[PDB]
Design a protein around this ligand. Structure first.
Ligand SMILES: Cc1ccccc1OS(=O)(=O)[C@@H]1C[C@@H]2O[C@H]1C(c1ccc(O)cc1)=C2c1ccc(O)cc1
Ligand SMILES: Cc1ccccc1OS(=O)(=O)[C@@H]1C[C@@H]2O[C@H]1C(c1ccc(O)cc1)=C2c1ccc(O)cc1
Lengths: 235, 9, 226, 10
């Protein structure tokens, strides 16, 4: 239904489906605490989720899935997707995480909430890693789509049918990535290398998500009803 | 099932 | 030195360094089941450490760096080996030649069913793709070096292993398009293996067994951020 | 650490 897309068509599809960069509520007059910091992040993430759900609908191949499968992928990949978006926004702000245009934080402000500075450093390291490889927006939207379709593809005779379609879509996104790198004047070992480099970072993004969610489902500062629902999927 | 509802616009 | 290797020399080096397939101690309660696995995993850890030393580029790292990679990747490495062993045994997990387990046996331990199914899913996924041993040893080394690097020399080596993987695929007669597609399919699986590892250690550092002083030392490395 | 020993071990 959407496998007949050329690479260029895949790209603009992804680029036009991009969610906006939302703003926070801070307010640098409030002296900031663990509770205020957490509130800001929770309010922000919660609003992003609404845009994320509607973005996913515009990811090629996603609506061809049953509602059950759609629910599962988002339940598995939401924080991963928030994280890579965070990392992407922050590419031009070294040593800083741009949660919002009005919410730019350094690792010291991450110490405000316990066990968050570790993930903060990882997010920083990823952001710098992207800046170093000079990630492109076209490459980014592809990466983010890959996270959505891949994070929960495994985790009936009909359940195996949906899995194969997703694999077909993922392969189409791979081809798109290669296409992009080729047009940038990269060699071929370079394309393969860069491809491998990018996909390996998804492992780290998954790692940060798991460690991130591990702390989040131990809790003070009321999570939103949608956030609680997503969070509940990972127990 | 908010996610379920929002996926159904 | 590892950078000077050829793709064939890379594979050969990696194959030759393969740890042996250990046996388990000759029904299952939650304690005995956990006992067998802990013992088996404790013994495997010793060979992994020697295997790591023979991974091209790994000895070039400081001792601090070597310890760090091993601490992060040990369960991932145990997991990909298990999934690989269970290649030709659909529906079963081959922990050892004398320890071939299925879903129902995995229900003996609280929370292990979920990881078992994932492990089984990864296995059949390997089976469906016809994962070759040459590719397997490349993947396993990548896990060691990539998990966790962001936690430059390593990336030079990572690029080298990538070169090796493509070189293997080109050997098997895959077209260019089939080559990057298969490369991507393999690295995306590593994302799941990372996931299985994280959920696995979530439970591991809550538990009954004696648990090795070395094994608790590997577990303590992940507790520091619980 | 015990891991330090094994990595330097023969
Ligand atoms: C690990 C941890 C400990 C304590 C508190 C939160 C923790 O999770 S964390 O890894 O840092 C995470 C990362 C990042 O800060 C957290 C967070 C987030 C999401 C929901 C929520 O209720 C609170 C925080 C982040 C984020 C937020 C918005 C984005 O658009 C993108 C990413
Ligand atoms: C998540 C969990 C819940 C309850 C008990 C253990 C749990 O961890 S788990 O994810 O399944 C894990 C996977 C697999 O079974 C566990 C396990 C292992 C390792 C050490 C140990 O002391 C106990 C178990 C596995 C394994 C073992 C040896 C191998 O060569 C390869 C893999």
């Amino acid at each position: 239904l959407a496998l007949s897309l050329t690479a260029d068509q895949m790209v603009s599809a992804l680029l036009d489906a991009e969610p906006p960069i939302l703003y926070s509520e801070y307010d640098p007059t409030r002296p900031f605490s663990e509770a205020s910091m957490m509130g800001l992040l929770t309010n922000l993430a919660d609003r992003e989720l609404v845009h994320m759900i509607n973005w996913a609908k515009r990811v090629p191949g996603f609506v061809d899935l049953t509602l059950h499968d759609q629910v599962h992928l988002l339940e598995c990949a939401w924080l991963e997707i928030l994280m890579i978006g965070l990392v992407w926004r922050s590419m031009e702000h070294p040593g800083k995480l741009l949660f919002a245009p009005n919410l730019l934080l350094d690792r010291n402000q991450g110490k405000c909430v316990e066990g968050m500075v570790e993930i903060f450093d990882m997010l920083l390291a990823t952001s710098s890693r992207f800046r170093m490889m000079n990630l492109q927006g076209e490459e980014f939207v592809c990466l983010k789509s890959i996270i959505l379709l891949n994070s929960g593809v495994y985790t009936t005779l009909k359940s195996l049918e949906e899995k194969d379609h997703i694999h077909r879509v993922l392969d189409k996104i791979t081809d798109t990535l290669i296409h992009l790198m080729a047009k940038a004047g990269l060699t071929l070992q370079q394309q393969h290398q860069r491809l491998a480099q990018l996909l390996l970072i998804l492992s780290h993004i998954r790692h940060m998500s798991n460690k991130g969610m591990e702390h989040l489902y131990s809790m003070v500062v009321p999570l939103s009803d949608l956030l609680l629902e997503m969070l509940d999927a990972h127990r | 099932k908010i996610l379920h509802r929002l996926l159904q616009d």
